Motif scaffolding. Structure first.
Motif, PDB file in Angstrom:
ATOM      1  N   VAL A  53       0.787  -1.226   0.000  1.00 57.36           N
ATOM      2  CA  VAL A  53       0.000   0.000   0.000  1.00 57.36           C
ATOM      3  C   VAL A  53       0.817   1.274   0.000  1.00 57.36           C
ATOM      4  O   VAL A  53       0.375   2.367  -0.402  1.00 57.36           O
ATOM      5  CB  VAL A  53      -0.931  -0.046   1.248  1.00 57.36           C
ATOM      6  N   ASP A  54       2.234   0.975   0.158  1.00 58.13           N
ATOM      7  CA  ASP A  54       3.054   2.131   0.504  1.00 58.13           C
ATOM      8  C   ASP A  54       3.741   2.735  -0.714  1.00 58.13           C
ATOM      9  O   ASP A  54       4.883   2.455  -1.022  1.00 58.13           O
ATOM     10  CB  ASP A  54       4.129   1.768   1.535  1.00 58.13           C
ATOM     11  N   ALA A  55       3.032   3.579  -1.430  1.00 57.06           N
ATOM     12  CA  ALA A  55       3.471   3.988  -2.743  1.00 57.06           C
ATOM     13  C   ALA A  55       4.786   4.766  -2.721  1.00 57.06           C
ATOM     14  O   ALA A  55       5.563   4.627  -3.691  1.00 57.06           O
ATOM     15  CB  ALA A  55       2.352   4.804  -3.423  1.00 57.06           C
ATOM     16  N   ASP A  56       5.087   5.558  -1.723  1.00 55.75           N
ATOM     17  CA  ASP A  56       6.321   6.338  -1.738  1.00 55.75           C
ATOM     18  C   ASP A  56       7.444   5.628  -0.992  1.00 55.75           C
ATOM     19  O   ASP A  56       8.585   6.126  -0.986  1.00 55.75           O
ATOM     20  CB  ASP A  56       6.152   7.775  -1.235  1.00 55.75           C
ATOM     21  N   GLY A  57       7.234   4.470  -0.409  1.00 53.61           N
ATOM     22  CA  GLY A  57       8.329   3.733   0.182  1.00 53.61           C
ATOM     23  C   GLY A  57       8.863   4.322   1.465  1.00 53.61           C
ATOM     24  O   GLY A  57       9.968   3.970   1.874  1.00 53.61           O
ATOM     25  N   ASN A  58       8.137   5.180   2.168  1.00 48.39           N
ATOM     26  CA  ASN A  58       8.593   5.746   3.430  1.00 48.39           C
ATOM     27  C   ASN A  58       8.288   4.869   4.603  1.00 48.39           C
ATOM     28  O   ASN A  58       8.685   5.224   5.715  1.00 48.39           O
ATOM     29  CB  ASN A  58       8.089   7.154   3.620  1.00 48.39           C
ATOM     30  N   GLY A  59       7.692   3.682   4.369  1.00 51.79           N
ATOM     31  CA  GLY A  59       7.492   2.731   5.431  1.00 51.79           C
ATOM     32  C   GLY A  59       6.157   2.752   6.120  1.00 51.79           C
ATOM     33  O   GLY A  59       5.896   1.899   6.958  1.00 51.79           O
ATOM     34  N   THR A  60       5.318   3.754   5.804  1.00 47.67           N
ATOM     35  CA  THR A  60       4.023   3.891   6.431  1.00 47.67           C
ATOM     36  C   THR A  60       2.983   4.225   5.366  1.00 47.67           C
ATOM     37  O   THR A  60       3.342   4.595   4.252  1.00 47.67           O
ATOM     38  CB  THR A  60       4.035   4.932   7.549  1.00 47.67           C
ATOM     39  N   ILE A  61       1.716   4.045   5.695  1.00 44.33           N
ATOM     40  CA  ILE A  61       0.594   4.363   4.805  1.00 44.33           C
ATOM     41  C   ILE A  61      -0.015   5.694   5.229  1.00 44.33           C
ATOM     42  O   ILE A  61      -0.403   5.839   6.391  1.00 44.33           O
ATOM     43  CB  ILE A  61      -0.472   3.270   4.867  1.00 44.33           C
ATOM     44  N   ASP A  62      -0.141   6.657   4.326  1.00 41.47           N
ATOM     45  CA  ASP A  62      -0.823   7.913   4.611  1.00 41.47           C
ATOM     46  C   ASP A  62      -2.240   7.872   4.042  1.00 41.47           C
ATOM     47  O   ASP A  62      -2.652   6.895   3.386  1.00 41.47           O
ATOM     48  CB  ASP A  62      -0.006   9.095   4.089  1.00 41.47           C
ATOM     49  N   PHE A  63      -3.011   8.923   4.320  1.00 39.49           N
ATOM     50  CA  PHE A  63      -4.415   8.956   3.879  1.00 39.49           C
ATOM     51  C   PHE A  63      -4.517   8.808   2.378  1.00 39.49           C
ATOM     52  O   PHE A  63      -5.269   7.931   1.913  1.00 39.49           O
ATOM     53  CB  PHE A  63      -5.135  10.195   4.450  1.00 39.49           C
ATOM     54  N   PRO A  64      -3.815   9.593   1.575  1.00 43.13           N
ATOM     55  CA  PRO A  64      -3.920   9.383   0.118  1.00 43.13           C
ATOM     56  C   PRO A  64      -3.624   7.954  -0.353  1.00 43.13           C
ATOM     57  O   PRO A  64      -4.299   7.417  -1.235  1.00 43.13           O
ATOM     58  CB  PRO A  64      -2.947  10.417  -0.468  1.00 43.13           C
ATOM     59  N   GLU A  65      -2.603   7.344   0.237  1.00 41.95           N
ATOM     60  CA  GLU A  65      -2.282   5.947  -0.138  1.00 41.95           C
ATOM     61  C   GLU A  65      -3.421   5.016   0.254  1.00 41.95           C
ATOM     62  O   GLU A  65      -3.738   4.062  -0.473  1.00 41.95           O
ATOM     63  CB  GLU A  65      -0.966   5.517   0.555  1.00 41.95           C
ATOM     64  N   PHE A  66      -3.942   5.222   1.459  1.00 38.77           N
ATOM     65  CA  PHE A  66      -5.022   4.367   1.965  1.00 38.77           C
ATOM     66  C   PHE A  66      -6.234   4.520   1.081  1.00 38.77           C
ATOM     67  O   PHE A  66      -6.813   3.532   0.636  1.00 38.77           O
ATOM     68  CB  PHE A  66      -5.317   4.795   3.396  1.00 38.77           C
TER      69      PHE A  66
HETATM   70 CA   LIG Z   1       3.868   6.101   2.459  1.00 35.51          CA
END
Ligand SMILES: [Ca+2]
Ligand SMILES: [Ca+2]
Ligand SMILES: [Ca+2]
Ligand SMILES: [Ca+2]
Ligand SMILES: [Ca+2]
Length: 145
Positions: A53-66
């Motif tokens: 789910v983690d499109a930018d690869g920063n290790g976490t899911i943000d609202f836009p990704e979710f």
């Molecule tokens: Ca992310």
């Protein structure tokens, strides 16, 4: 794309996972939710789920990704929905297997008056496990091809 009510609903869903309200879902937070629902994944399993789910690869899911997920899952769900329902109609006795007799009756109802040898060829084409019936997996694999 989305109404304000849709966005509010998916913000409430996100908040379920974003325990600490920092705007991100971590592997730990996903694990907390999973555990609440009766499954205890390992860190490796949780990382795979986040990575999917983690499109930018920063290790976490943000609202836009979710949002982008959830719109992928929901469409998949509506397709799924359909193949299902169809299937349950063809499977006249509900036992999870479309028999030749069932397939013939529903084909006649669809306007096609078929012989036993025509329907047996239809099943043989789709039959994977060789039981002379169509189960849901066989049904889906043949519909989406
Ligand atoms: Ca992310
Ligand atoms: Ca968080
Ligand atoms: Ca496991
Ligand atoms: Ca059946
Ligand atoms: Ca079969």
């Amino acid at each position: 794309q989305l109404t304000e009510e849709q966005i509010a609903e998916f913000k409430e869903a996100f908040a379920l996972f974003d325990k600490d309200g920092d705007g991100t879902i971590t592997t730990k937070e996903l694990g907390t939710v999973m555990r609440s629902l009766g499954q205890n994944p390992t860190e490796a399993e949780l990382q795979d789920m986040i990575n999917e789910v983690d499109a930018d690869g920063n290790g976490t899911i943000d609202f836009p990704e979710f949002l982008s997920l959830m719109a992928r899952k929901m469409k998949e769900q509506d397709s799924e929905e359909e193949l299902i329902e169809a299937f349950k109609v063809f499977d006249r006795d509900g036992n999870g297997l479309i028999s030749a007799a069932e397939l013939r009756h529903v084909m006649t109802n669809l306007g096609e008056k078929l012989t036993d040898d025509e329907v047996d060829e239809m099943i043989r084409e789709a039959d994977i496990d060789g039981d002379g019936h169509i189960n849901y997996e066989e049904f889906v694999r043949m519909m989406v091809s």
